[PDB]
Write a protein that binds this ligand. Sequence first.
Ligand code: 4CC
Lengths: 218, 222
Amino acid sequence: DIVMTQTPLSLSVTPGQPASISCRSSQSIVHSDGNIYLEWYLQKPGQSPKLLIYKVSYRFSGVPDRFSGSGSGTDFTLKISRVEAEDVGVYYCFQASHVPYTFGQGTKLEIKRTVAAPSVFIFPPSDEQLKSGTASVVCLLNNFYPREAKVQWKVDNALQSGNSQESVTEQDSKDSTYSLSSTLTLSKADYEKHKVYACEVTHQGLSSPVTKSFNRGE
Amino acid sequence: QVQLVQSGAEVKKPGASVKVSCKASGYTFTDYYMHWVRQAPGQGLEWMGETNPRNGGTTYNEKFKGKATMTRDTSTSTAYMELSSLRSEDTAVYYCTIGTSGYDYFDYWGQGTLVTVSSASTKGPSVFPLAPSSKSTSGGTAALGCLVKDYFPEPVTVSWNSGALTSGVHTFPAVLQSSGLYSLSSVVTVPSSSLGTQTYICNVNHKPSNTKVDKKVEPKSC
Ligand SMILES: Cn1c(CNc2ccc(C(=N)N)cc2)nc2cc(C(=O)N(CCC(=O)O)c3ccccn3)ccc21
């Protein structure tokens, strides 16, 4: 099989910057008809891939002007003239010249936008969940940049450990930010042991940490 | 108008078989070759084969030959991919795709079917509201959401107000709990001034069990 090697594995560019992605084939990809069937696809997380470029340099219909492709022999390049927020995702190169057709390992595009501090929100367990014998407290960090944001759960200022899960979104395709959801789950009996439930948020855009909290039962 | 309608999700025990469907609509089924593509952790994106819509024959990627059986049903305009003796490595997203200009490109794709190979039973989620309150406000903005907890396996999809609310929506990637079950959350930032007139419903779809949940997130008086 023809190995398709993409460089870099992760591309990070500032807004207003061009983006170039290299795709190297381990063998020649000249179809028997004389053409090179080299394509470029963009995939957003939990979305199917989208066609950008076909046959090395032809821009697919409806694809923005900024996208273009080139390459010769075994060397191929995907070009973005000026990156837009909607450009984030994973770019894959693909050959359909020789069977079996093969894709590259993909290149993740990241927009290095201006530092943005998160907006912090907290949600006590709903009245519904409390009837089940379990209590989940959620802390939301919204629209921040960069992705490195630390959450510290505190119960009456005692730093919590071992009962929380967190998840960060893919980069937002409108404003180039990230959002983080953190869930602290305790049994109702353990929930009813503490009063002050707090999430302390540390980030590059925050001069000092942000603490969102509530008093259980208030 | 061309649409490739896929199974969405499938859960199967190891050693069992799965038949992944791809229903064609908005075009004459026999005009274009149907392709199958695997997206698996590590291995990544892999073309599995192309099925001739006329003779019904498939040109396989040698790696998937035998293991995968790609057929084309002209009576229901549905293409099928059958994976035999499922193993944990077979857990992946399976896409059907077509090309409308000869063998130049893949312009139309299905949504993908997430096939999970597991001995564990399918489990529907709990859907708890993350109610807006004085504790979830940020300068004229109110955050609200849904916590989708305790399901198995993946995926869960979330929409707000049947797809009519998308601005400020963040559906978080699932987390794997200490029990082996999954959990995710989905949040939206809305004007705080409109909490008294708008209704916000999270539409939860646990694809493997086909559980559809419409949960109203009512404001909290706290
Ligand atoms: C290998 N193969 C494929 C597989 N698809 C494919 C899609 C995308 C890609 C890719 N991503 N590059 C790679 C492969 N499609 C083909 C179309 C023709 C063709 O020229 N015709 C016209 C003649 C007529 O009118 O019948 C045709 C059209 C429909 C049915 C049969 N033949 C020849 C060969 C083909």
